[PDB]
Amino acid sequence: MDSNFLKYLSTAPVLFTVWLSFTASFIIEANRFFPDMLYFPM
């Protein structure tokens, strides 16, 4: 892949959007498979 396009994907708004979309996505998946976790189960 082109190094200037990879340097564009390393810019702050792209990495910020990708990282928090990934973060949002595994919170969504964790609350899909394990919903309503009001407490640490113990």
């Binding site: 200037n4 396009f5 340097k7 564009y8 810019t11 969504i28 609350n31 899909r32 919903p35």
Partner: protein, 742 residues
Amino acid sequence: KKVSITVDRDPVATSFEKWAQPGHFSRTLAKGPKTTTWIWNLHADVHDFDSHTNSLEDISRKIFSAHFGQLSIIFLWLSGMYFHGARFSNYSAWLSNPTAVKPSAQVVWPIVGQEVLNGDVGGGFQGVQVTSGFFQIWRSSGITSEVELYWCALAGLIMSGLMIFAGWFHYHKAAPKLEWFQNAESMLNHHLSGLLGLGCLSWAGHQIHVSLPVNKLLDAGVAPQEIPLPHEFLVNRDLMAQLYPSFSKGLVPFFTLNWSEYSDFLTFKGGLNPVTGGLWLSDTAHHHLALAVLFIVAGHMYRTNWGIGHSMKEILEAHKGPFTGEGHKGLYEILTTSWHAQLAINLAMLGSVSIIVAHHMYAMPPYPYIATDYPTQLSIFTHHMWIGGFCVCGGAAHAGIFMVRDYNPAQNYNNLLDRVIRHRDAIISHLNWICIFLGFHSFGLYIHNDTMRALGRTQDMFSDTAIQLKPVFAQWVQSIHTLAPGNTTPNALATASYAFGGDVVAVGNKVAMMPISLGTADFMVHHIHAFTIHVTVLILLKGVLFSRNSRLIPDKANLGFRFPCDGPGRGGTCQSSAWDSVFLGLFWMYNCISVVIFHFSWKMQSDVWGTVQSDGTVTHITGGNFAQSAITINGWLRDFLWAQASQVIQSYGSALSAYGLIFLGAHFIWAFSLMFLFSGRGYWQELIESIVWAHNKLNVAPAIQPRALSITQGRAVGLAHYLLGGIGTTWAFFLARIISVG
């Protein structure tokens, strides 16, 4: 042949290199950030092409390709509306039963309990009720199935790809030269004749050959899948003749000028279709055909390459009299060399047209079954009033940018601009006086009524029962429009709109339209409107007229369009720029449009919308309380805001709980905006100093030194969050209220 196509081939190379260099477009930003202000400075000036480049040719090329990019976004958006109608909607159920099924084209995923938003809209469907009126558009088009909606979504996707390709091609491969863009006569000839006239003509052909037969069959009561496909209307003329017998004669009556043969499908009925509560589609077909001829004729006015036509410069330069000096001389040169002057005009016109669209669509409801879908009627009025107000304020923003930047006095000696600037004190002092007079004599009537009603003196009020302010001119104009069918429009059968007077139109036991009577409350709120429009003009006009210089700052043009102040001297010159009058005038636009949409909402619920019952009497939504309660401020507070906020604040646990949450969220954002509006930058920079100290202590200070936002950006952030919160609160309140009760 001085109108010719001229193109530079391969101007700009298609490279990813400048993507990796944020700020490449300006000399200041291209050397990289040293403070966080650079980041904000990067986004603020990016589409300001004439601040980066000196040449009008490169500016014009960037604008043309950015317009293709905008068209690509609009086509993708339309494609998604059609795809969501095809795939995630109850459109087919709505076609079978319109007056019972509620339109819904948005379905949510089940994640955190949010699937409560998939409410029971009807037709064996669960989803979010949609209020954009797409279903009524599609039924007017004659869609009748989800398959045709899939083909429309694909057509939108193909157009979106073609526009993004064309923007790339016309910037990087084939960019026109400046002399191509500076063809105002050619562009107007093609945009009147070609864009508007052919567009109207082609739509008229669709209405005559597709919309009119499908909708006649639908309103007769034929089931949607029992209706013939639209091309069998095109080929078999016999079935089309069975619906409208004039088609048995074909195009011989058109060419021989025996046009009254076509009166089956080219009517001038007026009024509404009783079955659907919408405009007669035979009227809309005749309307579009008439417009097409007028627009195509209009397109032959200007001179391009053969000697026939007008010179626009000669028309402008000939209109000058004894009051106005050199007249309109020099305006052609302005409007073909300044993009901002053109954007100022076109934004004022687009905003005005959007406000006209808002008025004309509730009063003469054009689509079948849109008049009795009250959430859609309220939604499309409120939406087009907000688009109109925003675009009107952007016309004054770019008039200010023209005056500061593109205006040159040498070419504007003693013409109309020079003369306006040379008596701007007389203009602003007379406008200021009008705004004071009209605020006293409009809002002071409300304050007089609150005081008298509170004091027990109801005979001393401005009301129908007491002292009467009667809107005699508007009542008289309503009389004229009710008398017009058969009198001053003799071939009309019904009035243009039943709002002026006449019958009550009922569809599915709900009122489509009925006369909107005017009383003392209507006089008062109309002068409230005149007052809020006048002062908004004063703030924007004062900003445009004093953008270059004042008695306060004699060299305001050297500071620019957007500067925060010129120091604390001369008593203090905070917010002296033209930008700061756009900033202050968007608040007054917000005030004006909020009272307009509140007036519309309360008046339609109180006096127009409702359910027809036995004996022909109509029970309105709020039972006719507008007349005696819109005359005090306490009436608006209690009987409009408090009474109708019941549905938004009781919405939790229902499908309208999303509106309940957005009501609070927008109330929050609005309050949060006042942190930015009431504060000053210097406090926040000194607070940031102590926070920087705590980062310095742990050796974690950033290399991009944090700054408080600029004075101008602090104002812009405050205004943006103010507009978002105020409009969002109204949006949530209006939508939860009218979905529950209408």
